[PDB]
Design a protein around this ligand. Structure first.
Ligand SMILES: *C(=N)N1CCC[C@@H](c2cnc(Oc3ccc(Oc4ccccc4)cc3)c(C(N)=O)c2)C1
Length: 266
């Protein structure tokens, strides 16, 4: 009583460990048994009513490679967003841990995991809008999942919203010049993410400012081949960066290309 299907009763949460500091993220349990992460939204950081309405839509998105939304806690402030627990944290930090000594087949599987999530979203006409390694999460089996999908829409802090904390390094020319978002801006960002994976978490355009990156990209220049990427892998990531948005592949085509490489570099 008093809760929609999208609504979690905060009294059903057991908090166990802070994971990091939108605000704080904690690890805990739901109804004693189910591991969860609980993102606590800072007062004033988000358009909450719009987010709540979107959450209803988001609860119906379901795919193995998309972090599963369990629901939202709306009746008090700060509001909470509750997901499955991803024990190995952010993809970006995971990549940067040199101890893993990743084989390129593992890096390719990470790309494939994300590509599968993104093909699903594309099939639902849902844009991510801020695809990057910092946003992807890794579970205890090393499976990568897409997280924070669409979330940028409800952030109120203007520095994130338009072209000084905007994702310049993951944005195609039409976004940086004209604010033209589309499926093909997610495709661009995916290619940059493949670059992040194959670079073991280097910052894209690591010696440039955002300002310089925007100018580089606008002039037609691109990220170059990470040393761990084969010529075929680099071909895939590069195809995501065509100057013409409609010459960029779809996520279905990218998935087929990644599967082909996996098979050939098996
Ligand atoms: C990366 N270095 N970090 C710090 C360590 C904790 C990491 C983290 C952050 N969030 C979650 O869970 C999560 C993610 C996204 C949420 O909101 C959301 C989800 C889907 C669409 C829109 C918005 C809510 C919670 C985890 C986790 N799941 O373990 C870990 C981040």
């Amino acid at each position: 009583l008093g809760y929609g299907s999208w609504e979690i009763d905060p009294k059903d949460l057991t908090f166990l460990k802070e994971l990091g500091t939108f605000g704080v993220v904690k690890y805990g349990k739901w109804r004693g048994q189910y591991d969860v992460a609980i993102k606590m939204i800072k007062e004033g950081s988000m358009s909450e009513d719009e987010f709540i309405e979107e959450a209803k839509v988001m609860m119906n998105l379901s795919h193995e490679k998309l972090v599963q939304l369990y629901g939202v806690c709306t009746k008090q402030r700060p509001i909470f967003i509750i997901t499955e627990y991803m024990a190995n944290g952010c993809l970006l930090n995971y990549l940067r841990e040199m101890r893993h000594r990743f084989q390129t087949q593992q890096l390719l599987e990470m790309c494939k995991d994300v590509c599968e999530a993104m093909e699903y979203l594309e099939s639902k006409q849902f844009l991510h809008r801020d695809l990057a390694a910092r946003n992807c999460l890794v579970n205890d089996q090393g499976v990568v999942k897409v997280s924070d999908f669409g979330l940028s829409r409800y952030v109120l802090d203007d520095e994130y919203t338009s072209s000084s904390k905007f994702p310049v390094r993951w944005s195609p020319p039409e976004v940086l010049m004209y604010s033209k978002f589309s499926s093909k801006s997610d495709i661009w960002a995916f290619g940059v993410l493949m670059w992040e994976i194959y670079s073991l978490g280097k910052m894209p355009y690591e010696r440039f400012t955002n300002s310089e990156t925007a100018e580089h990209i606008a002039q037609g220049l691109r990220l170059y081949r990470p040393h761990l990427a084969s010529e075929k892998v680099y071909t895939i990531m590069y195809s995501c960066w065509h100057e013409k948005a409609d010459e960029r592949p779809t996520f279905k085509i990218l998935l087929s290309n990644i599967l082909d490489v996996m098979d050939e570099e098996s």
